[PDB]
Design a protein around this ligand. Structure first.
Ligand SMILES: CNC(=O)c1cccc2cc[nH]c12
Ligand SMILES: CNC(=O)c1cccc2cc[nH]c12
Ligand SMILES: [Cl-]
Ligand SMILES: [Cl-]
Ligand SMILES: [Cl-]
Lengths: 695, 697
């Protein structure tokens, strides 16, 4: 049920042993020695990765190394659709702007931070959560020129439990991380967007990289002289597979959770955040779908835009299902009522006062937050011409020196990016008419961005006419309209441009709402410090984990399926047979790689198939994971690698607020399927040979 | 393969049934010379199956079987279709016009009689051995002179089985006074509605209650206010013990049609012509209908039923083609015929190989014709609404060419035009469907094979299908109300003879009839060869594990209450519960609305003695019984013959079961009798119906 701090391993060890853990405590996490923890990395600032060889080979998800596979791909060598398999270390491709972060040391610095904070004065100061303030304390503690005395190292202090616990992390960062191997996108992204958040899953979501360093294994930027890193710890790969009920554990960097939400915050997340996102994206996606289905060229231009909007839409549907069916609101209400009753008993009323302050702040910001989500979902992300060019003061104080041509060249560059090869003004007008009709129904005239008041005032409520007039008269309405402007440009034309006025107006309102809403975060945050302190003093820092905050955590559970609905059961493991069942040659998402199809037909599964002869693909577990856990190593009871985490099912997305034992699962690619693809699809034996594969 | 067995076959199947769990005595289930459970089974309204459940003639069947009767008695004042109907006294039960219940009184093997009569052959190629007229002449001869007059309510019928190798005579007792007694609201009776058609898991309470009425002596009588409820020979006891996984289950009913003795060439034809054309053509039709319904809420209202009606057989064809592609149906038919051919070669009897060859040759010869027939039927006859627009009759055209009979002809044409262009017809939606359907039709059917008017697309319109369809409506007398009225004011024979819509409709119907007539002669050599083919199969492997094709006659099937795995890592259990109804609840979707009385029952757990051992309220279960269309409403029995449910559907994965039974996929979808009794009790409050049933603990 939790995402535990490494410090909490001692207090959780006995239960983990009861659940099946066989390894010694300090072999997993040692605060003053080498352990399995030293083989986990933060891959490219978001994902998790893991070292799997004494030469710095790193495994992570295909969707984690996707940008690097795409950057090295050309029409000549398309690594994204064909895969990439460097047959020698010298063939491994360097990557610009990549990093791998090791968590070298972790220390509890709570007393230090709390004593430094006492020099306050302002009791409402937010310095206790300020990265700038906490970095000043981290540098003070580490020393004057720490990074120069310990090269490649850096320190960071983070708040936990709403400002009740602080940890200082000593990090070692490597920036020479090279692409080694990747399956084709047909394997790496088999489900593609249709199977996102879906269990059963049949995606071989993996990619292979390598950490490079100088002669002494110290961090160094890309250099042709860099040598592969010999890490102090790497995972052994298990070939024993998984069975139902097997103990499993994960280490990784979960990003965010909201475990200490009040009941009022759950209601707000549902009725504002999720309902607005669901309704607004449903309108946007509906119009996009009609247009993509009717014109194959529109499908090409809008596929990525449609898929990008669907991802958080699906999350919101999944989260609202948990609020409606799993009693999230009620369990938060029970959590706060129990603290309020215990505080009354002890004579300490500050916890009830804290929950009341949160409720009052939530109730007060309701209309503002509704207006913010309505404009953000409805217009800022809903309508493409909202992100059309807005002339700067530098560009206007140029059109009225003769760098008038330099002003127009900068405006043209931005116009070309807005009206790019994937932009359809006709599709955008149709989306805007449906999105603005909904926006104008929900937001009253007095709360409208100034230019939208023209719908009622100048266009007699005809939204279609208003949108038609924006494109007919705007210099960004077509290429010919822009060129006519660029030939005779005046500041008076830009100041009265209907598209510029629309874009400026909606951005002004979006910033005004953001600025007016920002002051409401602080009383909530301060009250959460008192609220979580009460919860911890009452029930202990034992079965209540601190919210995720992109720091290293461990979670444990079992390889287990679940029943999604009445009379339906999803098992704990998918097979290669499931890939073949889903095969569809006339659908890019469900195309099956011919080398993999042949492997399946011949049953060329080597040492990777199970005891029954079926080739495993993926499994699911009751571990508690969230965004940031992509690429996380999944370990056995002996700490051996059995898979990589790559997703979680939609039924469990409400798990960020309340873990769902009967529904929430981590979706993991079986390590045996990873090895089968490297071996029979990539034919990259050197990668298998450098790993320590245990029978 | 698993079987829809003749009643005569119970004797030789009994031992296996007992070894599979059957506990009742053979003659208590079926006795040719006495009362048995078979006497409580009826053919409900000529299609469905039903069952007698009380000593006062109460009959249970599906909600979709009694749907028309519930709809005919419904008004805006008392909407029984939407709220349910529960007659609180026998006198309140509603009579029904044109209803019937047929009991199978006696069944007799008359094979030797029919085969001896057939020996008086005046042509060896005669189809009289399958002729209902001929077989009725033999049935009347055997029953005697004036049998119907000397035995009122009874009738005799002889049917061919095993392709003309076995014949049975059925003595039927028909009752026509069958009254509506009870029905749940449509929210329960058709809970899944079209979304869950052919779907397992299923949560639909598909049942309705009727009562057979008869004269003072329990003899058939048409509706009369003097009719008394029938005291039947036999009725089912209701079991409350429920079902468990692996329990023995059995069904009696009237399965309509199967194709168990198809050759491999007939499976290929079913796939590549019948199913592929239906799939492709309905996909085009449904796609255009969906875009129009989604864009205009008034179009959704007008085309919902038309869209749902087209989707039903489309889904069946997708399910059947999935079995041909994944379950090896073609290969198993090929293995079946190769084995007979090899055995015939050893017996020195080449007639079986000659028979399979005649079938293959006939299938190969009719291929282009059959492709053209399905292409026009799916593409135009069903695909385009203006294909069924008015065509002036020879007598209507004669009337328009010096009398007052011209206004009588115009009134008749107007009546047909108003039925075509009714409140649910959109000419704009029809033009869009026709453009897409004709574009596909014109791509598949060559100019020389086109219905005469479609040749104008290339000849007069330069291949512009949109222009051709636009011109049909712009110039046609049936293109709009104003166009019809202008014609009706000044009607001329010449205007109808040159009308583009009349010419289109006539042309496509002419080609549809020409193709049907040219294809009809191919059925007979196949049928005759099937008589030899099935005779060989029976002589070789016996009339034991090879059931005769379904032909709307009484059959039994048996199996177990068992779920199945539809795909990798997914398992569907054997039973659904009332929780599954609640999970699917959606108030803003008419299909998934939950009745408030039922929702309250679930919340209070007011399940009485109807819940299972774990206090969960069962709704439906599935079984490995072999069923098909005609089995809707069938009684599902326990190992003791007690009623445990009513069959109401089968899953799409098993629709290929009409050709080859699929043990690991095919299931009968059954409404649990405990859920039926819960709805009568806690939703209808109709205690008298529970009291007249014999409920066993
Ligand atoms: C076709 N429908 C979907 O793909 C979908 C819809 C809503 C939520 C989720 C979560 C996963 N998939 C979803
Ligand atoms: C709503 N249901 C469908 O879309 C569907 C589509 C194709 C086959 C089947 C069988 C049952 N349902 C089907
Ligand atoms: Cl290291
Ligand atoms: Cl012979
Ligand atoms: Cl099977």
């Amino acid at each position: 049920e939790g995402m535990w701090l490494m410090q909490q391993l001692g207090r959780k060890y006995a239960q983990m042993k009861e659940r099946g853990l066989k390894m010694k405590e300090y072999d997993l996490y040692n605060p003053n020695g080498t352990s399995l923890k030293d083989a986990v990395v933060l891959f490219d600032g978001g994902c998790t990765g893991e070292v799997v060889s004494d030469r710095g080979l790193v495994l992570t998800n295909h969707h984690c190394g996707y940008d690097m596979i795409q950057a090295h791909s050309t029409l000549e060598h398309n690594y994204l659709e064909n895969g990439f398999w460097a047959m020698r270390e010298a063939d491994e491709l360097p990557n610009k702007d990549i990093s791998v972060v090791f968590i070298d040391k972790i220390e509890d610095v709570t007393d230090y931070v709390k004593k430094e904070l006492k020099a306050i004065k302002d009791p409402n100061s937010m310095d206790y959560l300020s990265p700038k303030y906490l970095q000043k304390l981290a540098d003070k503690k580490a020393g004057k020129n720490f990074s120069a005395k310990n090269p490649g190292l850096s320190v960071e202090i983070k708040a936990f439990y709403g400002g009740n616990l602080y940890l200082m992390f000593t990090k070692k960062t490597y920036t020479d991380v090279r692409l080694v191997g990747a399956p084709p996108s047909s394997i790496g992204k088999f489900g593609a967007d249709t199977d996102n958040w879906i269990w059963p899953r049949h995606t071989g979501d993996f990619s292979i990289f390598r950490i490079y360093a100088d002669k002494n294994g110290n961090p160094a930027p890309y250099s042709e002289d860099n040598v592969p890193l010999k890490p102090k710890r790497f995972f052994n790969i298990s070939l024993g597979g998984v069975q139902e009920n097997d103990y499993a554990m994960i280490m990784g960097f979960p990003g965010t959770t909201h475990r200490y939400f009040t009941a009022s915050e759950v209601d707000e997340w549902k009725s504002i955040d999720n309902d607005i996102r669901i309704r607004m994206r449903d309108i946007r996606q509906g119009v996009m779908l009609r247009e993509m289905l009717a014109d194959p060229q529109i499908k090409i231009m809008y596929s990525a835009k449609y898929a990008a909007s669907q991802n958080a839409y699906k999350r919101a549907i999944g989260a609202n299902w948990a609020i409606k069916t799993r009693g999230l609101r009620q369990n938060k209400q029970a959590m706060q009522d129990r603290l309020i009753a215990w505080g009354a008993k002890q004579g300490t009323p500050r916890y009830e006062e804290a929950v009341h302050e949160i409720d009052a702040t939530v109730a007060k910001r309701a209309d503002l937050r509704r207006r913010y989500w309505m404009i953000e979902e409805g217009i800022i992300r809903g309508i493409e011409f909202a992100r059309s060019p807005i002339p700067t003061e530098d560009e206007t104080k140029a059109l009225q020196a003769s760098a008038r041509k330099e002003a127009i060249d900068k405006i043209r560059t931005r116009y070309s990016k807005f009206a790019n090869k994937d932009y359809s003004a006709e599709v955008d007008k149709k989306v805007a008419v449906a999105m603005l009709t909904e926006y104008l129904k929900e937001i009253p005239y007095e709360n409208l961005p100034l230019h939208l008041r023209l719908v009622k005032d100048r266009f007699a409520g005809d939204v279609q006419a208003y949108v038609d007039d924006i494109f007919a008269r705007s210099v960004f309405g077509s290429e010919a309209q822009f060129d006519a402007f660029a030939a005779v440009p005046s500041v008076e034309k830009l100041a009265e441009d209907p598209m510029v006025l629309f874009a400026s107006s909606v951005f002004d309102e979006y910033r005004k709402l953001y600025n007016e809403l920002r002051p409401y975060d602080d009383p909530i945050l301060r009250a959460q410090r008192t609220y979580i302190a009460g919860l911890l003093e009452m029930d202990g820092d034992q079965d209540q984990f601190p919210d995720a905050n992109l720091t290293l955590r461990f979670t444990y559970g079992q390889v287990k399926g679940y029943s999604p609905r009445d009379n339906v059961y999803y098992g704990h493991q998918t097979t290669l047979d499931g890939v073949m069942e889903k095969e569809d040659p006339d659908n890019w998402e469900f195309v099956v790689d011919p080398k993999l199809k042949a492997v399946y037909e011949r049953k060329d599964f080597g040492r990777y198939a199970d005891r029954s002869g079926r080739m495993p693909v993926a499994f699911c577990a009751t571990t508690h994971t969230t965004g940031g856990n992509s690429g996380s190593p999944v370990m056995n009871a002996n700490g051996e690698l059995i898979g990589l985490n790559f997703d979680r099912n939609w039924e469990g997305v409400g798990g960020d607020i309340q873990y769902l034992a009967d529904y929430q699962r981590s979706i993991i690619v079986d390590i045996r399927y990873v090895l089968l693809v490297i071996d029979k699809v990539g034919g990259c034996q050197r990668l298998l040979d450098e790993m320590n594969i245990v029978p």
